[PDB]
Amino acid sequence: MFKSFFPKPGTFFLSAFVWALIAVIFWQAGGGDWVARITGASGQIPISAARFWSLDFLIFYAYYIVCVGLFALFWFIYSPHRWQYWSILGTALIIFVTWFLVEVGVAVNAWYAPFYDLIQTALSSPHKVTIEQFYREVGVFLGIALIAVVISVLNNFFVSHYVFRWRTAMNEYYMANWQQLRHIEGAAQRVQEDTMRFASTLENMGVSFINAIMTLIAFLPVLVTLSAHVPELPIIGHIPYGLVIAAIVWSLMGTGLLAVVGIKLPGLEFKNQRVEAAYRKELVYGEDDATRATPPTVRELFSAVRKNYFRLYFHYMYFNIARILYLQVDNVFGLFLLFPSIVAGTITLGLMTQITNVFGQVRGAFQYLINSWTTLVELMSIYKRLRSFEH
Residues of this chain that bind ligand PGW (CB under 6 A): 13, 16-17, 19-20, 23-24, 27, 56-57, 60, 63-64, 67-68, 71, 88, 91-92, 95, 99, 217
Q: For ligand PGW, which is the closer residue by CB, 18 or 150?
A: 18
Site string for its own copies, 114-153 (x = CB under 8 A): -----xx-xx--x----x--x---x--x---x--xx--xx
- Burial of 348: CB neighbours in 10 Å, binned 0-12, 13-18, 19+: exposed
Binding of residue 368 to its own copies (CB under 8 A): yes
Q: Which of 318, 325, 282, 327 is nearest to 300 (CA)?
A: 282
Give the separation between CA 245 and CA 257, rounded to whole angstroms.
17
| Residue from the set 28, 44, 331, 388 that interacts with its own copies by CB under 8 A | 331
Nearer to its own copies, 70 or 138 (CB): 138
Residue 192 interacts with, from its own copies, ligand PGW, none (CB under 5-8 Å by kind) = its own copies
Report the residue numbers after which the chain has a gap, meaning the C atom sits over 2.5 angstroms from the next written residue's N, or none.
none
Question: What whole-number distance in Å separates Cα of residue 137 and Cα of residue 133?
Answer: 6
Nearest residue to ligand PGW on Cβ basis: 27
Report the residue number, 95 or 239, with the smaller CB distance to ligand PGW.
95
- Cβ partners under 8 Å of residue 12, min gap 6: 6, 75
237 φ/ψ angles, rounded to the nearest 5 degrees: 120, -110
Q: Distance (Å, rounded) from C-alpha 254 to C-alpha 243?
A: 16
Q: Which of residues 62 and 188 has its CB atom nearest to its own copies in the complex?
A: 188
Can you tell me the distance from the alpha carbon of 45 to that of 244, in angstroms, rounded to the nearest whole number? Answer: 28
In whole angstroms, what is the distance from residue 148 CA to residue 154 CA? Answer: 11
Q: Give which of 255, 246, 256, 239 is closest to 220, Cα–Cα.
A: 246
108 counts as binding its own copies under rule CB under 8 A: yes
Give the span between the Cα atoms of 373 and 131, in whole angstroms.
47
Map the footprint of its own copies across residues 187-216, applying CB under 8 A: 187-188, 191-193, 196, 200, 204
Closest to its own copies by CB, 221 or 364 = 364
Among 300, 336, 387, 390, binds its own copies (CB under 8 A): 336
188 binds, among ligand PGW, its own copies, none (CB under 5 to 8 A by kind): its own copies
Quickly count: other Cβ atoms within 10 Å of residue 379's Cβ.
19
Residue 74 binds its own copies, judged by CB under 8 A: no
Q: Is 328 in the site for its own copies (CB under 8 A)?
A: yes
Looking at the Cβ atoms of 143 and 256, the one nearer to its own copies is 143
Q: Which of 168, 205, 216, 245 is close enough to bind its own copies by CB under 8 A? A: 168
How many amino acids of this chain bind its own copies (CB under 8 A)? 73
Contact 45, 51 (CB under 8 A): yes
Residue 50 makes contact with its own copies by CB under 8 A: no
